[PDB]
Amino acid sequence: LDSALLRPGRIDRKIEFPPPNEEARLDILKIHSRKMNLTRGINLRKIAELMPGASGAEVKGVCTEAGMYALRERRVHVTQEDFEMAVAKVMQKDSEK
Amino acid sequence: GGRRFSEGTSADREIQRTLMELLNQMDGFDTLHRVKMIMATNRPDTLDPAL
Amino acid sequence: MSEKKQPVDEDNWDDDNVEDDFSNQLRAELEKHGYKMETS
Amino acid sequence: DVTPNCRVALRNDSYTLHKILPNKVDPLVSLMMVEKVPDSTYEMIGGL
Amino acid sequence: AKLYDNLLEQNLIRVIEPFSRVQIEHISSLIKLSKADVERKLSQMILDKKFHGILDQGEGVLIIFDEPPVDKTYEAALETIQNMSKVVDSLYNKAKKLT
Amino acid sequence: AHHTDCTFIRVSGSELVQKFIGEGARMVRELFVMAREHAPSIIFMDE
Amino acid sequence: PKNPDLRIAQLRFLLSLPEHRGDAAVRDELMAAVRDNNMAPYYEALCKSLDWQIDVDLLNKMKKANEDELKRLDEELEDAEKNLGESEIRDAMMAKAEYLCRIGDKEGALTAFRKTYDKTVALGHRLDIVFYLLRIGLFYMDNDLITRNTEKAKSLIEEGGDWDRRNRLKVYQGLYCVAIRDFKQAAELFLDTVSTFTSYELMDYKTFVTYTVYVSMIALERPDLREKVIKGAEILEVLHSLPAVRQYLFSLYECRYSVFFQSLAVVEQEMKKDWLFAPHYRYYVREMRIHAYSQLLESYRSLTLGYMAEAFGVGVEFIDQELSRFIAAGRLHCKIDKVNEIVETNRPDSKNWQYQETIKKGDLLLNRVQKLSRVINM
Amino acid sequence: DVLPPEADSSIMMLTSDQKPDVMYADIGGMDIQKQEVREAVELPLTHFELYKQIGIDPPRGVLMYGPPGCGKTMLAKAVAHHTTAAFIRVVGSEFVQKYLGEGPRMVRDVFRLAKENAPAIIFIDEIDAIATKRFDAQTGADREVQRILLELLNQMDGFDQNVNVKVIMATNRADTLDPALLRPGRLDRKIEFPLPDRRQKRLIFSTIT
Ligand SMILES: Nc1ncnc2c1ncn2[C@@H]1O[C@H](COP(=O)(O)OP(=O)(O)OP(=O)(O)O)[C@@H](O)[C@H]1O
Ligand SMILES: [Mg+2]
């Protein structure tokens, strides 16, 4: 961007936004996992480790999608293998180009 | 005809619309039977590939 | 108002019907059946 | 009570002012809504 | 086995159909099966209410009877009652408090 | 802006937005008319 | 903290009401009570308890430690407001007001809760505050205050799915519907038993399993028992850890009527000793008897009365006096013969029995609008 | 007097001499996208209470695009053929009427016909004929179009997830568009039509030959 925009009297504060670590991949699975109909016993930590830091949008990209597995097999409770089945598909799109 | 644009002048707007009217009118949702189209140009370079 | 001349001077109701029917009847079954085992 | 930027009821024969037409829109609420930003909160923040 | 339960009961509703009463000794002969498991199984029909009727222990006469009872009339007028009771409970909240 | 209750006004430079700013808005500074009208405000911009 | 706080109330029940059983409860309840800053909820429990004469210093060290937590709120509210965050005062006592709720009474726990209700613009704090008000609304059995925040609770789950805020919530409504004798609703709130979790209040998930089977065995019929609770793998394996309840459930399902009463005295006596079932275990087994009598008795028409002793449950005259008060109680639709020693059944068509409840409710609302129409307009 | 609703567009796709008789088997080599749009359109139409019960927010509208001759019209003919709900099929360059207001009324009455009629299915083609990018309030022929986009922009927002009114929109160039049309709450599902290379390609050879 502009150097006149990078005048030191111009900008008051610049704040960096890192990609999430394994802990910050866990809590977005937590918040995002709220509104789903779950099955008891999941171990979200493993699934948070299955993504090695894409961003905060691939969290929602997986965990929204995992209900399509349970719905396409006509479930009413989301099970944990839909999540690893979803990480295999979303991370394939990480592996595409 | 035209190819397309990135929306330069005001004139091409409704002309591109008039074109897309024609395109959907070619083979959109119709058994185009017994009606044969014969077209001509001097340059086939200024044309929509979708056409 | 309310002069009221004086010639003299849930939590309750489901408990009151089961109080009505469940009133005076043996009170302490752990042993009544276990003593009907051998007598009956 | 007459506000700038306010609709009115109007009679048609002499254009006599009839009645104040409530209110229409803010020029920021209108376009703002047209945008439809996804409103958020602290309770959906993941570790920041 | 589970298909044999539904086939057993498919025959069991089949032969029991045309009458009102019979003895267990004829239906045991007509399905060509015993009487104890058939008696218990008919009891399970009238326990699970899939078939309804009654049974006998003296000789085993199964009294079969059916009519669909009137149900829509009374209960659907009965839940309106407990709506309106709550409505009168709301009438405390605009009547008893107010005047 | 939601929590401190500031008027969260982003801009996109679109033309549907344009009719509410003005007839042409030869500047962008016509936005400040509505901005100081919602004076505790925050302007937001994309890349 | 309100997460272990129900066992406290159950052990208050364990202290007072079993009268002979009043020693280990005043041991372990004191063991929890004169620690973790508990001051308020046990003065009258000390009145029901023994003297415990020197509790003065015991209360003074804990109102002192309570004074430390209050004075550090008094150390917090002013640095919280000088540089204001998200109203960091109510952000401090939005979490330590529950310490004011367990430790303080409902007033400092209530206000501060309705206080901090207006702080968080999202329900992620609000609805959990509401869960706390529900849980104290159970502790003080505030049967009207639960009616408010149940609806105020439910008003927030529609936005979002919040199935950790709904499936958790249905556990609360099931505990209220089993608190009152509303058992067709209690099992209905207990319908899932999967999204229900290994909770804090039924820390045994299997205790929750026992409760939903005890309410369901009255609440639903066979067409539901012979598909629902018999084919659930989620229900079969957890009571596969249970010998008694597995036998107790299957003794009705496998027509095992004689061993059924054997386990019925044990389960019913456990329900006698249990908190919150202690209001209604009589109501339980008086239905269990007439249910087991009606189930067998709607199979036979000409079954004698001296059949049911050796096969159903022993005591011929016991069957006599038990049936006579049930036909005479107006249920158990049959007719017993005596001096030819045979019991006959009948069938009531659903035209009289269905009529009965109609005239009951009509008389009730007649009383209602009668009473109101007298009350208003002087 | 109050009126039953009316719209003078394609009435309702008269369903007798209206099926474009295109089977699903006529489309070879679209295994992902045909199943995927089946998930998006008629699966929440019928199996609505799975989306409701789990609560996974079934999509409001759907966009599809890509190079031309990629079955864009064809898949609409197949879904339009094998559908069960009422189907509305518009030629999206028709809102530019000579008279003013005929366009915006022509917007709202169609949606009222989808409202009144059924849990219905909208289809729009040539979205570039409306949704351009730049505008100019000096012609009126541009301003009318501006008011066209405002109406549909509002009326997509005027839903409540209760109606199963699913909007299918097919275009060719995604570039010549406003992403304010692509806001979530309005558009959440986007389907490119890439060209098959060999794999699905030989399937088209099997089907055509
Ligand atoms: N299985 C198939 N897959 C892809 N294309 C096919 C297939 N079968 C036939 N086609 C041809 O591809 C064309 C796709 O028709 P359609 O009108 O849907 O194209 P389109 O993608 O809408 O492009 P346009 O918008 O330019 O018409 C058809 O005209 C047909 O001749
Ligand atoms: Mg086409």
> What is the DSSP code string of C1-40?
------S----SSHHHHHHHHSSSS-S-TTSHHHHHHHH-
3-state secondary structure E1-67: CHHHHHHHHHHHHHHHCCCCCCEHHHHHHHCCCCCHHHHHHHHHHHHHCCCCCEECCCCCECECCCC
The amino acid sitting at F38 is: H
Closest to G134 in 3D by CA, of G90, G176, G104, G100: G176
Q: Three-state SS for H125? A: strand
| Structure-block tokens of residue H181 | 């049309």
Distance from the alpha carbon of residue B16 to the mean position of ligand 1, in angstroms: 22
From CA G216, how far away is CA G225, in angstroms rounded?
8
Choose the residue to mutate in H70, H89, H128, H207 for probing ligand 1, maximizing ligand atoms within 8 Å of C-beta: H70
From CA E55, how far away is CA H45, in angstroms rounded?
49
Asked if A56 and D44 come within 8 Å (Cβ–Cβ), the reply is no
Which of D:1-48 have CB within 8 Å of F? Answer: 27-28, 30-32, 34-35, 37, 39-42
Closest to G116 in 3D by CA, of G133, G129, G104: G129
3-state secondary structure chain G: CCCCHHHHHHHHHHHHCCCCCCCHHHHHHHHHHCCCCCCCCCHHHHHHCCCCCCCHHHHHHHHHHHHHHHHHHCCCHHHHHHCCCCCHHHHHHHHHCCHHHHCCCHHHHHHHHHHHCCCCCCHHHHHHHHHHHHHHHHHCCCCCHHHHHHHHHHHHHCCCCCHHHHHHHHHHHHHHHHHCCCHHHHHHHCCCCCCCCCCCCCCCHHHHHHHHHHHHHHHCCHHHHHHHHHHCHHHHCCCCCCCHHHHHHHHHHCCCHHHHHHHHHHHHHHHHHCCCCCCCHHHHHHHHHHHHHHHHHCCECCCCCCCHHHHCCCCHHHHHHHHHHHHCCCCCCEEEECCCCEEEECCCCCCCHHHHHHHHHHHHHHHHHHHHHHHCCC
Cβ-contact G333, G291 below 8 angstroms: no
| Structure-block tokens of residue H12 | 């309702």
From CA H53, how far away is CA A37, in angstroms rounded?
8
G244 vs chain E: nearest CA distance in angstroms? Answer: 23
Closest to H55 in 3D by CA, of A70, A36, G155, A71: A36
**Beta pairing, strands F7-10 & F41-44:** parallel
DSSP H8: -
Distance from the alpha carbon of residue H71 to the mean position of ligand 2, in angstroms: 7
Cβ-contact H84, H42 below 8 angstroms: yes
| CA end-to-end distance (rounded Å), chain A | 26
From CA C2, how far away is CA C12, in angstroms rounded?
29
* Number of CB pairs, chain A paired with chain G, less than 8 A apart: 27
Question: Based on the number of CB atoms within 10 Å of its own CB, is E99 exposed (0-12), middle (13-18) or buried (19 or more)?
Answer: exposed
Closest to H153 in 3D by CA, of D30, D40, B7, B24: D30
Closest to E41 in 3D by CA, of H139, G299, G306: G299
H182 in contact with ligand 1, CB cutoff 6 A = no
Cβ-contact A94, A58 below 8 angstroms: yes
Q: Three-state SS for H170? A: strand
| Structure-block tokens of residue C5 | 């001349």
CB under 8 Å, gap of 24 or more: what pairs does D13-18 form? none
From CA G170, how far away is CA B7, in angstroms rounded?
58
Query: Among all ligands shown, which has an atom nearest to the Cα of H193?
Result: 1
Nearest 5°: the CA angle G191, G229, H54 is: 35
From CA G330, how far away is CA G352, in angstroms rounded?
12
F6-18 core/surface letters (b: 16 or more CB in 10 A; e: else): ebebeeeebbbbb
Distance from the alpha carbon of residue H42 to the mean position of ligand 1, in angstroms: 22
A28-62 core/surface letters (b: 16 or more CB in 10 A; e: else): bbebbbbbbbbbeeeebeebbebbeebebebbebb
Nearest 5°: the CA angle G270, G276, G280 is: 75
Ligand 1 atom with minimal separation from the H73 CA:
18
Cβ-contact A24, D46 below 8 angstroms: yes
Q: Three-state SS for D10? A: strand
Secondary structure element (H or E) that encloses residue D18, with its range: strand D17-21
Any bridge partners for residue H125, and if so which? Answer: H91, H170
Q: Phi and psi (nearest 5°) for D9? A: -85, 145
Measured between beta carbons, which residues in chain G are less than 8 angstroms from residue A37? 161, 163, 195
Measured between beta carbons, which residues in chain G are less than 8 angstroms from residue C36? 314-315, 318
Any bridge partners for residue D7, and if so which? Answer: D21
Cβ-contact A72, A32 below 8 angstroms: no
Asked if H56 and A74 come within 8 Å (Cβ–Cβ), the reply is no
Measured between beta carbons, which residues in chain F are less than 8 angstroms from residue H146? 15-16, 19
DSSP H55: I
Cβ-contact G240, G246 below 8 angstroms: yes
Nearest 5°: the CA angle G288, G289, G290 is: 95
Question: Cα C26 to chain center, whole Å?
Answer: 12
From CA E23, how far away is CA E25, in angstroms rounded?
5
Q: Could you tell me which residues of H are annotated as the binding site?
A: 66-73
Closest to H190 in 3D by CA, of H170, H165, H162: H170
| Structure-block tokens of residue G91 | 């952000």
Closest to G177 in 3D by CA, of G276, G312, G246: G276
Q: Which spans in F1-47 are helix H? A: 18-21, 31-37
Q: Which partners does chain H have (≥3 C-beta pairs < 8 Å)?
A: A, B, D, F, G
From CA A70, how far away is CA A78, in angstroms rounded?
6
Asked if H68 and B49 come within 8 Å (Cβ–Cβ), the reply is yes
Nearest CA in chain D to H152: D34
Secondary structure element (H or E) that encloses residue H121, with its range: strand H121-125
For helices G281-297 and G257-273, what crossing angle results, to 10°? 170
In which residue are the tokens 């009956």 written? C40
Closest to H113 in 3D by CA, of H73, H86, H136: H86
Secondary structure element (H or E) that encloses residue A57, with its range: helix A56-72
Cβ-contact G341, G308 below 8 angstroms: no
Cβ-contact C32, G313 below 8 angstroms: no
Q: Phi and psi (nearest 5°) for G156? A: -105, -20
Asked if F18 and H180 come within 8 Å (Cβ–Cβ), the reply is no
Q: Which partners does chain A have (≥3 C-beta pairs < 8 Å)?
A: D, G, H
DSSP D42: G
From CA G5, how far away is CA G160, in angstroms rounded?
29
H66 in contact with ligand 1, CB cutoff 6 A = no
**Beta pairing, strands H87-91 & H121-125:** parallel
Ligand 1 atom with minimal separation from the H207 CA:
1
D27 vs chain F: nearest CA distance in angstroms? Answer: 6
Query: Among all ligands shown, which has an atom nearest to the Cα of H68?
Result: 1
H28 in contact with ligand 1, CB cutoff 6 A = yes
From CA H106, how far away is CA H95, in angstroms rounded?
7
* Resolution value (Å, 1 decimal): 4.4
H70 in contact with ligand 1, CB cutoff 6 A = yes
G39-56 core/surface letters (b: 16 or more CB in 10 A; e: else): bebbeebeeebeeeeeee
Q: Rounded to whole angstroms, what are the CA distances from H143 to A73, A85, B21, H134, H176?
A: 49, 49, 20, 11, 18
Distance from the alpha carbon of residue B46 to the mean position of ligand 2, in angstroms: 21
From CA H75, how far away is CA H35, in angstroms rounded?
11
Sign of the CA dihedral running G66, G71, G74, G75? negative
For helices E2-16 and E36-48, what crossing angle results, to 10°? 90
Nearest CA in chain D to F15: D31
Asked if G268 and C29 come within 8 Å (Cβ–Cβ), the reply is yes
Nearest 5°: the CA angle G297, G303, G309 is: 85
Closest to G5 in 3D by CA, of G135, G94, G110: G135
**Beta pairing, strands G342-345 & H121-125:** unpaired
From CA G162, how far away is CA C36, in angstroms rounded?
53
Nearest CA in chain D to H153: D34
For helices G257-273 and G244-253, what crossing angle results, to 10°? 130
H73 in contact with ligand 1, CB cutoff 6 A = yes
